[PDB]
Amino acid sequence: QTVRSSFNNINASISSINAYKQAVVSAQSSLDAMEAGYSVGTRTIVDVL
Amino acid sequence: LLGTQYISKQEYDQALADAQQANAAVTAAKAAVETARINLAYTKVTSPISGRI
Numbered sequence: 001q002t003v004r005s006s007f008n009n010i011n012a013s014i015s016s017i018n019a020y021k022q023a024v025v026s027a028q029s030s031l032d033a034m035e036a037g038y039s040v041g042t043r044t045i046v047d048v049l
Numbered sequence: 050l051l052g053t054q055y056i057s058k059q060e061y062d063q064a065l066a067d068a069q070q071a072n073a074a075v076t077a078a079k080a081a082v083e084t085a086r087i088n089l090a091y092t093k094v095t096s097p098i099s100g101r102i
Contacts, residue, residue, distance in 0.1 A: 029055075032053065032055065033050075033055040033056075036050055036053055036055055037050060037055065037056075040050060042050065042056075
């Protein structure tokens with residue numbers, strides 16, 4: 001149960017990374033939608049931050 | 050904001066609808082001034098030809 005716990009933790013935690021590695025690519029896209037959206041003016045500086 | 054594709058392509062055209070229709074409204078009001086400017090060429094009654102009065 002201990003060995004299969006870690007082996008089924010690391011198989012989760014790879015997919016956990018590829019979840020939250022996409023969640024960066026979401027949020028890095030959403031940030032750059034703000035920095036381009038604030039440099040032209042549609043979104044404000046607090047919707048940036 | 051769509052060079053870097055960061056808004057919808059739909060919300061752009063919808064604003065480009067509003068851009069092009071409001072510029073089509075100015076043309077529908079610059080003509081409406083041109084309707085009422087030409088009343089002020091119809092006041093101050095212009096002698097439509099030359100010659101003797």
